[PDB]
Design a protein around this ligand. Sequence first.
Ligand SMILES: *[C@H](O)[C@H](C[C@@H]1CCNC1=O)NC(=O)[C@H](CC(C)C)NC(=O)OC[C@H]1CCC(=O)N1CC1CCCCC1
Lengths: 300, 300
Amino acid sequence: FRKMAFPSGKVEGCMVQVTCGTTTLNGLWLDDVVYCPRHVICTSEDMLNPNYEDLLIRKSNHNFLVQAGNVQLRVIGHSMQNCVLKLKVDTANPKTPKYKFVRIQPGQTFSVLACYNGSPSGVYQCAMRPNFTIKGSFLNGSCGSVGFNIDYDCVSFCYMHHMELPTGVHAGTDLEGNFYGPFVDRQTAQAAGTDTTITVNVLAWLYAAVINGDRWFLNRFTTTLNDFNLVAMKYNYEPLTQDHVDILGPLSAQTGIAVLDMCASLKELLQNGMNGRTILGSALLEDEFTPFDVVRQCSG
Amino acid sequence: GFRKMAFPSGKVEGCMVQVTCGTTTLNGLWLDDVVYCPRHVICTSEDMLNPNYEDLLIRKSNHNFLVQAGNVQLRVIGHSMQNCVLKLKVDTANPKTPKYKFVRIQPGQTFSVLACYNGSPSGVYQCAMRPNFTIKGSFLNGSCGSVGFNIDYDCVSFCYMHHMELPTGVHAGTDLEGNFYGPFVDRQTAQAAGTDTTITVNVLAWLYAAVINGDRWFLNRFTTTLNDFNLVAMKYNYEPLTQDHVDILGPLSAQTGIAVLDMCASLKELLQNGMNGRTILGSALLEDEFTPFDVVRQCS
Ligand SMILES: *[C@H](O)[C@H](C[C@@H]1CCNC1=O)NC(=O)[C@H](CC(C)C)NC(=O)OC[C@H]1CCC(=O)N1CC1CCCCC1
């Protein structure tokens, strides 16, 4: 059982380079529009309190250099939607996949295609943290990298990368340019709210460890949902809802371990620790596999 | 702060096809006008328990092989066997063939796996070749012929093709010349992996990573010979170092100014003395699936 990203080819064919001034980041080219973070228009000065409408009205199409590979794309118009800039170009991307823009919920996972200068460099799986950060790997120049899920032939874009926080986690927007979380695209050190652990995902993973013949942490006991949640919140774990219990059904049927029985195992682990032992390779409880993720990878 | 990060998979996605013999379907790799796949596609279940591949192959003709990209049949105009891979000459050169080569990697090296079923990619993830020549993959029925690769500049270096799952649930396969990694054979018989050891060169890369990040409590004032370190390491189930290992730690040694053999002395002390309750990069466990290349690629 492995942390698996979606194949990235459909997204790679959409990545381009966007330059304004001495700022270069990545853009997402879909049909005849390139989406990118609007802070590409900010100067060293601007970035502390950028009045974006005011800065954007002063820009001309020819101030934006867009390159796909060796070719430059002519910008013929631009608009702003929240924190994303939309550069209209004179050419349609023939590699545009079937796609939609979605806003994901905390606890949900997605694949990130990390890009630099419009060129893809790596792909990995991340989750929207309960505090709306993402624990990514992003360096200078990664802005405009996107996160996505694939269903059949449809790419659902859910994330565009904008910034790193002082703690080393990351923040960004959906493809409508609305941030996840209380963050703002100005050059300031911003802290997130307190993070918590995605409890339904930890349970999915424990079930995964059992499908793979790992069951040392199981115990003969059970718990009510509310008593489990009391203990969870004590340990800064998210509460488990009845929908979460329902979502865990398939994994429960598969292994014949009731959801609330696994909650009793997880309660024991929180109270007792792992005592040196490890689970599916990990010394820590893992919370960035969803129920769907576990199944998709025990399915094909 | 480190993630397993795969290479973008699009260039390899554009090479994946399916190969069927009778009812047995696995994946093939289409490069120029050749399709490469595991030779056991020619085996019925009865042949698998104990196959005569040379005789099974003589009985076959080009018209027994169904090669498809999607649902589009690719006509086979020739066939041959190289070690445990079948090479199917086809009448169409793959228009999406990237620049590529076939390399045989050493234990400890990491690579990206594009897991595929019926010629369609399902996921990409990073694997390390263990010293016992197995990988901890996530592979189901129908995954054979999925490949492992690295990308350098625009060149895809193919290093792995998947063939089997061992009793303990780890995975084995060949290079793209059909030579198995390790002592395994493509027969449905009882086979076991050697006892595995820790990848010393990668632990050292991880210690260099910790130093780059300012986490350097474990550095000591002493040094060692390569021979004395190797003899100590084997007593802790660590792999001895090779000269090539010393060389691929070169860039990280230069980046930090810590000679390789001084780092070895620091690792020797950790082995002999333990962590004493402390952590490195946030963990009490030493990581051994990040190569020196992985470290630089995520730090720089
Ligand atoms: C876009 O490519 C870029 C990606 C960042 C760079 C390093 N890692 C990333 O993910 N994004 C930015 O540069 C944003 C631009 C703003 C106008 C939104 N800023 C940003 O990420 O910042 C850098 C981080 C580093 C940690 C931190 O504190 N900080 C904020 C500022 C102010 C406080 C002092 C440090 C610099």
